[PDB]
Amino acid sequence: SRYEHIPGPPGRVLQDVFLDWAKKYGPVVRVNVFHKTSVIVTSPESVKKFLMSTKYNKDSKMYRALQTVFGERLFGQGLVSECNYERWHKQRRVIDLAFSRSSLVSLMETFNEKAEQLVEILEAKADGQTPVSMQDMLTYTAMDILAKAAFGMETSMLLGAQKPLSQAVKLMLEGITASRKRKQLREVRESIRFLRQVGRDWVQRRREALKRGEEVPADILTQILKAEEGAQDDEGLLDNFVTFFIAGHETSANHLAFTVMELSRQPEIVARLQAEVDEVIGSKRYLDFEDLGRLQYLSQVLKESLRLYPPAWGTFRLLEEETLIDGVRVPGNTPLLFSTYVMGRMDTYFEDPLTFNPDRFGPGAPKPRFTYFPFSLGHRSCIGQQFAQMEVKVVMAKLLQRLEFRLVPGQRFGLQEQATLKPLDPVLCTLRPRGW
Template sequence: MLLYALILALFCVYFYLNKSSNRNDLCKFPEPPGHPLLGHISTITSTTSIIYNLSRYIENYGNTLKLNIGPSVFPLSKSLVTIDYKFVKFVLSHNKILKKSQNYQFFRRWLGNGLLISDGDYWRRHRKILTLAFHTEILKDFVGVFESVGDVLIGKLGKYDGKSSVDVHRLVTLCALDTICETAMGTKMNVQSGENSQYVESVQQMGRIVIERTLSLIKVSKYTFWLTRDYYIQKNALKILHGFTLSVIDSKRNKPVEKTTKRMAFLDLLLKVSHDENILTIGELQEEVDTFMFEGHDTTAAGISFILYCLADHPEEQEKVLQEQKELFGDDKNPPVTYSDLQDMKYLECVIKETFRLYPPVPIIGRYTTEEIKFDDSLIPKNTNIIFFIYGLHRSSEFFPQPEKFKPERFQNFNSAFPYAYIPFSAGPRNCIGQRFAMLETKSIISKIVRHFEIKPTLPRHELKLSVETVLKSVNGIKVTLKKRN
C-alpha cells in the first residue's frame, strides 16, 4: 500500500505540472465540470459508464466538447468529443488526419503495427495490398462457407428450443470466428465444436483491458501496469492470441502456394506477397492476421447478436424479414443460398442497418492531429485526440426522426446527402476494409436463423447493460428466447 501511495503522489505532482501548461488549449470549446486533477475520469470510471456519460455531456454541453480523460500524460487527456456532422465529415474525409487517437497504442502488444493502428506510407501500402482480398469475386466464393458454418450454429441454437433464454452472443461469437478462419484464412479451426474457444475469451479480456487502461491511474503507464492483475491477464491472453494466429499461419505457410489466375483470399494473398514480392516480413504478416482475426469476428458477432435482440423485441419487423425469405425460397429452411440471393434481401439489409444505427458495433473511434488544423473559425492544436461518438451521432434527431425507435424502413429512403451521419463502419480513407464481407456474413446468418426460429424476448425482458470494450458489448449478455418454426 505504501508503494501505491508513493507512486500515486508522484503521478499527482507530475500530472498537475503538465496539466497547468496545457490548460489554455482548446479553450473555445465547452467543457463539462471535472476533477481539477483527474479531469473527467472521475465520472467516466468504467467501460459501462462511457455511453451514459458521453450521452449526458453531449446533451448538456453541445455537439462538440472538450474532455480531459485524466491528467496530461493520459492518452486522451486532451480530447474533443463530437457528433457534429460538419466536423465529423471534415476530419474523417481529411487525407492528412489519418493517425488513430492515442488510446489505440494499447493495442500494440497485441496487433503490432497492423492496419488498425498503422499510419503514413506504411498504412497506405498495406491498405492497398489488403484491399485486393475483398474483391467481389472472392466474396462470392465465401457464401458457401457462410452457409455451412451457419448450419453448425443452427444446430447449437436448436438445443435451446423452448428454453427460457439463450445468450446468443456467446454462440454467435464462436460461429463468427469459425467463419473468419475458414474464409479469409482458408483454415478450418472448428471453434464451435469446442476447439480453440480460449481465443474468444482472450479477445474479450483484451478488449476490456485496452479500454480500462485508458481510464486508470495505475494501468495507463507501462511502469505501473505490471502492478495490476490485468497485466498478468494480458500476458496470458497475448500468449493464447498470438499462438492461435501463428497456428493459422503455419497451417497455410507450409503448403506450396498454388499458381492460379483466381483472386486470392486474405491469408493466401499475404503469403504470396511475403514469399514472392518480399514486401511483407513474417512479423508484419502476423500483425495483419492478428488484426483481421480480431476485427473480422468480434464486431460481426456483436452486430448479429444485437440484430437478434432487436428482432425479438419487434415481431412485426421479424415477420417482414421472414416473408422476404419466403418470397425468395418458399418454405425451404435450408435452400442453396447464393450471393445474388443475399443481395436480394433488401428488407433484411434495412433491419441490419437500423440495428447498427442503434447499436453500432464500434461505438467510438478516434483520430489524432499531428499538426495544427483549421476548422471553420477554430484552430485545433497539434496533438489533440478527436473522438467520434458514433453511438450518439446515430441517435441524433437531426438526421433520424424518433431516434430511439426501431424503424428499419428509414433506410429504404435514407438521405444520402448526409453520408457521414451514419458511419457504423467509419468513413473516409480509413473506413472498414471488410464492411462488405461483414454485411454478407450477417445477412447469411440472420436469414438462416429467422427461417429456423421464431425469436422472442425473454420473460421478464432482458435489459442490456451496454459496455464499450473496443466493440459494443452487453456485460450481462444478449439474451433471447428461441422457438423452432414448424
Template sequence: MKVPPGPKGREAFGFFGGGSFAGTLEFLQRTARRYGPISSFRLLHKRIYLVDDADLVRDILVTQQHKFERDSGAGLLRELVGDALITREEPQHRDRRRVLQPAFHRDQVASYAQIMTAEAARLAEEWQPLETIDVRDQMRRLTLAIVGAALFGADFRESAAQVADVLRRVASKSRWLAPAFAFIEPAAALYRRLFPNGRSLFFESERKQLDRIVAPIVDRRHGSGTKDVVSLLLNTRDPADEPLSARAVQNEVVTFVLAGHETTATALTWTWFLLARNRHVATRLGEELHRVLAMDRPPTLEDVPELKYTGLVFQEAMRLYPPALAFARRAKEAVQLAGYTIPRHASVFLSPYVTQRNPKYFPNPEEFIPERWLEHQQPPKFAYFPFGGGAKMCIGEPFARLEGVLALATLARKWELECIDDDPVGLGTGLLLNPDRPILMRIRSRSTQVFQQSSPQPYTIEVQ
C-alpha cells in the same frame, strides 16, 4: 484562442465513465446534445474535442484526413495486435492495405457467400427447439468459423473457447485501460521501444495465446499456392525487397481473427436482441424470408438483392449499436474546423453511437425502425458511419455486411429467438460495444402458417 463550449471542471471527468463504457457514452451523448455539433473539454493537460455533425465527420475522415492520425484507441489496439493494418499510419497503412485489398474485392467477397451460408446452416442444424442459448457466444462461434474458413482456409471451431477467453480478459482490462489510455500511452510506447520484438505492456499473455492459435495457420500456408489473406502476406516484399517477418504476418492474422469475427458477432447479437424486443419487425422479417426462400432452403448470393428488409434490419441494428463506440483522431497540425482552430496534437472524438442517435438525422432515434432507411429523405452519408470512412475505413466492411445478411437470413428462416426475461441490457466493456451481460434467449421454431395464408404477391414495406 477561441475553443468550442463544453463541460468544465469535475463534470468533464464524466468522460472516464466511472470505469464503464456505458458511462463514457452517456457522457459523450449528453455533451453533444447540450453543446452542439462541436464541443470540447479539458482533462488534466489534454483538451479533447467531440464532433457530432455529419459534415464535420466527413471533413475529418475524408476531406482533411491527411491532417489527422489515429489517436489513443489505435495505441490500445497496438498493445493487443501489434503493428498491423488497423494500427498503421500513412504511407505504411496504404502499402499494407494494397497488399490485403484483393481478399476484400467485391468479386472475392462474393465468393465467400457459400461459406457464410454453410457455416450458418451448420449452426441452425445444431439448435434445438426450446433450448436456451447465450446468443453472443453463439454468434462469436459462427463468425469465427466463417472468418477462419473464408479468409484462412482454416477450421477455428476448436479454437473458439480460447479466443473467447482472450476476449473476456481483454474486456476486463479495457474497463480501466480504454478511457485512460491517452494518458498512459507514452509508457506503452516506451516499453515497445525497449522490447521491440512484439512485446506488450498490458496484453502480453493474451498476445502469446493468440500467437499459439494462428502460428499453425501461417506455417501451413508457406508454399501452398493459395490466394487467401495469409498467402497474400507471405508473398509480400517490404521496402527493402525482403519478405515480411513472421511477426508482421502473425500480427495481421491476429487482427483479422479478432476484428474480423467480433465486429459481426457483436452486430448480430444486438440484431437478435432487437428483433426479440420488437416482434412486429421480426414478423416482417419472417414474411420476407418466406417470400424469397419459401422457408425451405438457405439463401444464396443471388438472393441478397431480394433480401432487402433483412439488410435493413441489420443496418438499423448497427445504427443503434455500432460495434465501435468511437473513432479517435489526433491532429498532426493545426486544423480549421467549424470556425475553430484545432491545435496540433489535440484529440478529436467521433462517435457513431452518438451521431447515429442524433434526432437531427434520425427521428425517434432510440427506436428500432428498419423502415426509416426507405424514406425519400435520407440522412447525410456521414450521419451513419459504423465502419468509419476515408482511407482508413474498415477494409472488411463489404465482408461484414454480406455476412450479416446471409447469417441472419439462414438462421431466421428456421428459428426465432425470444428473450427469457425483460431485464434491461446495458453496454459492457471491451474493444467493441458488447452487451454488459450474456443475453440468454430461447429458441423457437419459426411458424410458417401465417405466411402460407398471406398473399403470394411480393412483400412490400410501407414507408412511415
C-alpha cells in the same frame, strides 16, 4: 490549460456520457480518453471534412491502446492501427485483393455452411424452455466463419472446441479498455502472447502446405503474407494476423447479438422479416449471392441496428495545425474523436433517435449525410464492410427462416464496452421452430 476554453464539463457506457456532453455542450467538446485530452466532433460538416480527406491521418497516440497492451504487442502496425499513410497504403492495396467482388462471392459456401450448422444446433434446443446464449452462439459462428474464410482453418467453436482461445480473446478485449491487479495483468499478457502464437502456428502450417505443394485457396492470409514479402521479420505479418483474427469476427458477432436482442421486442418487424425470407428463398437451405440483394427489408433492419448499436463506436484523426472547428478554436496536435454512436442518438440528426425504425433506410427516404458511419468513411473505412454485410445477412436470414426467439425475462438491453460495444447480457433466449 491549452484546452480550457473549449466547451465541456468541469448497461450505460462511456459513449453515453459523450452523448450527454455533446447534447449539452455542442458540436466540439473537450474530454478525457486514454489519459490524453481529445475533442469530440459531432457536426456532419466536420465528419465530411476530416474523414473524407487523405490530409487527415489517424492519431497514433489514440491507437497505442490497440498497438500494445501492458507491454505486449497486439495489433501493432497492422492495417487498423498503422497511422503512417504511406505504410498503411502499401498494405491496404495488397490486402484489398482478398475483398474483391469475386473473392467475396466464393465465400458464400463458408457463410452458408456455418450458418446452417448454427441453425441445426439451435433447432435441437428449440423447446421453448432451454435458455440459449445467443451472444455466445453468434460469437462462435462468427469465429468459425472468419477462421475458415480468412485463414483456411477449422476452429470448430460451434462444436464446443477452442475454449482457451475464446477466453484469450475475452481477456484481451477487457485489457484494451482496462488500460485507459497482478493476476489481471498476467491473464491479459498471456492471452495476447497466446493469440500471436496461434498466428505463428497457422502461418507455419500455411508455409508448410505451400512447400509440400498442396492446394491452398487464395484468402486474406495469402495477401497478408504477400504484404510482407521481403520484411526483415514476421512481426508485421503477426500484427495483421491478430488484427484480422479479431476484427474479422468480434464486431460481426456484436452486430448479430444486438440485432437479435433488439428484434426480440419488435414482433411486427420480425413477422415482416420472416415473410420476406419466406418469399425470397422459400425452403432453400442455401442463399445465393443474388438472393442477398433481394432481402431489402432485412438490409434496412441491419442498417438501423448499426445506427443505434454500432459495435465500432468511433475513430480518431490527428489535427496537426490549430483550426477553427464549428466556431471553436482547436489547438494543433490534438486528437479529434468522431463517434457514430453519439450522432446516431442525437435528435438533431435523427428524429426520435431511440425509436427502432427500419423505414429510415427505405428506398425513397432521405439518406443520412455524414451522420451515420458504422464502418467509418473515407480511405480508412472498413476493408471488411462487404464481407461483414454478406455474412450477417446469411446468418440472419437462416435464423429467420427456421426459428422463433423470445428473450428470457430479466435480460437487459444495456451495453458494455470492451474495445467494441456489445450487449451487457448474454442475450439469453428460448427458441421454437417456425410453424407452431
